[PDB]
Design a protein around this ligand. Sequence first.
Ligand SMILES: O=C(O)c1ccc2c(c1)C(=O)N([C@H](Cc1ccc(O)cc1)C(=O)O)C2=O
Length: 358
Amino acid sequence: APQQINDIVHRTITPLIEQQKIPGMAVAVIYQGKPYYFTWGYADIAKKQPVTQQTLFELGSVSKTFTGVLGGDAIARGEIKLSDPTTKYWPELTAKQWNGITLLHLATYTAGGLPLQVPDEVKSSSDLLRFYQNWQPAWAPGTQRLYANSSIGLFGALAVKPSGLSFEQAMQTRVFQPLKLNHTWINVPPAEEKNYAWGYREGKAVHVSPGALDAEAYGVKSTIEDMARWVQSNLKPLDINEKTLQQGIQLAQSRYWQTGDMYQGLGWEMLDWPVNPDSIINGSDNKIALAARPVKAITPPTPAVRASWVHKTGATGGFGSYVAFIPEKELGIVMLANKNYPNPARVDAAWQILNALQ
Ligand SMILES: O=C(O)c1ccc2c(c1)C(=O)N([C@H](Cc1ccc(O)cc1)C(=O)O)C2=O
């Protein structure tokens, strides 16, 4: 890499790994459109397998960026509308609290207090229906944001219904394949297990467990190469030759709601660039990120703003990830680690690197 990128990356990441006791890490910097890769430590401690550019990490809720783009792509295809009632795609959802709850509300965590987690009890299609039927909103639709797997998870499941495809097939054929993300998976195949890092929680090797709406909310695994390519695609959607996918990416970066200095997209979250690093850093802390916050509707939504800091944190029990990019500067970063360490440490390291190269 250019020495500038090398030095800022290593001088920022080395201390982070030490301070947080991170077993393995991969970083990609996208600088003037081109990716540069960095890796440290172990994908598998016990088997002494190092982190490489081919190592798969659990993205956790960074998966919501894929779900949001896939939803965008369905909109562009004319298959769904964000203004559609939820019941349009799930007529069995007859409980009266659902009146006025649209696909927009589901995608943007504004349905009125859907929970962070789908309960472990919920397994079957009939279990899921019962869960949403029984759910009682704390707030009217479109008044408060409460970050929720159960909200965008349901969005993803419904958004693919008109296509006739499973969520996984839709994602593979409409997002992964066109973008040549050939080492990105909802379900890791046996042939790729050699590359699948272990997550580490309290020193034990762990992988994410199956759960209702897992694929939609937190279930994507990917390499640093594919995630750099994901960032590139979201940095420059006009280079994408598939019309609906290009359009879907733009819709995922539109600003639907504002709370404080942040704007809600589909999966992605955005702030105006230049950002106050204390906003993104402190703002990334859970329970500001996971707290109930009133939202201002952006009527109509602002199309993707180039001068934005666009980002998403994500975790699983054993993994911590972060992606951030600034379209205007052709600049971005992906940080993948096999330990779930605090969001603020991720965003601080990310800002230190991008601010230096900016
Ligand atoms: O191991 C798992 O099963 C697992 C699954 C999904 C998530 C996490 C862990 C996880 O930590 N997040 C956070 C959100 C979250 C934070 C705290 C918490 O207790 C649950 C979820 C995120 O990525 O946004 C998740 O969304």
